[PDB]
Amino acid sequence: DYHLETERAQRQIKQKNMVDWIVRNVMKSITPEQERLMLSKCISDLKAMSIKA
Amino acid sequence: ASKRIARSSIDWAKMAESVPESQKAMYNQFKAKSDGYIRKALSYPEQPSPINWEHYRKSLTNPAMVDAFKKQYEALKVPYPEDKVSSQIDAQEAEAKKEITKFIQESRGRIENYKAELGKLGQMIPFEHMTLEDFFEAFPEKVLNPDPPSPNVKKKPFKNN
Numbered sequence: 001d002y003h004l005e006t007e008r009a010q011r012q013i014k015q016k017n018m019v020d021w022i023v024r025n026v027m028k029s030i031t032p033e034q035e036r037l038m039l040s041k042c043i044s045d046l047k048a049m050s051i052k053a
Numbered sequence: 054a055s056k057r058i059a060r061s062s063i064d065w066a067k068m069a070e071s072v073p074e075s076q077k078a079m080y081n082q083f084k085a086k087s088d089g090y091i092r093k094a095l096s097y098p099e100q101p102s103p104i105n106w107e108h109y110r111k112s113l114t115n116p117a118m119v120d121a122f123k124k125q126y127e128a129l130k131v132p133y134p135e136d137k138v139s140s141q142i143d144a145q146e147a148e149a150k151k152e153i154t155k156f157i158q159e160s161r162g163r164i165e166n167y168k169a170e171l172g173k174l175g176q177m178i179p180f181e182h183m184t185l186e187d188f189f190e191a192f193p194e195k196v197l198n199p200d201p202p203s204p205n206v207k208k209k210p211f212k213n214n
Binding site: 004007011 | 109112113114118119
């Protein structure tokens with residue numbers, strides 16, 4: 001039970017640490033060329049939903 | 054590991070009939086004292102509680118410590134401890150046997166005395182057609198010259214003080 005709770009405590013802090021690391025890394029990594037590509041994909045997906053009727 | 058599981062129990066009924074109740078009231082203490090150790094014998098059976106080692110192996114990231122714990126648990130399997138005062142009980146058992154034989158032969162002697170007394174009463178002539186001399190002969194309490202005098206020679210007419 002001690003090893004299980006130690007593993008659970010280490011798993012919980014690693015999950016919390018990787019969550020805030022991913023949030024900070026995703027927010028700090030914003031590029032305009034990828035933003036325009038995602039904008040074009042959103043327009044194409046909107047056009048695909050209009051066709052799907 | 055063997056010998057006495059909780060199923061073993063001597064016949065209390067014959068033992069309870071044998072003792073003279075409050076004359077051997079320590080048996081009433083002894084049975085409850087033994088019953089208390091039965092309560093300890095009620096708990097902790099032979100095998101312990103099984104543990105699912107595979108659940109802890111899969112849940113823990115590194116199950117090598119669980120394997121080491123399981124290997125050490127299987128290696129450390131201590132057997133039963135040693136009997137201490139069994140020889141003293143055996144020594145008192147032999148002393149009890151001697152007291153058994155001594156009490157048996159003394160009771161046999163007293164039984165033969167009571168049988169001889171009943172044989173005397175069986176061979177005694179009845180009190181209806183019995184002469185007074187034969188009453189004195191069958192019961193040697195008697196009266197004679199070196200005897201306590203009394204106005205009526207009775208069982209206790211002499212001192213009365």
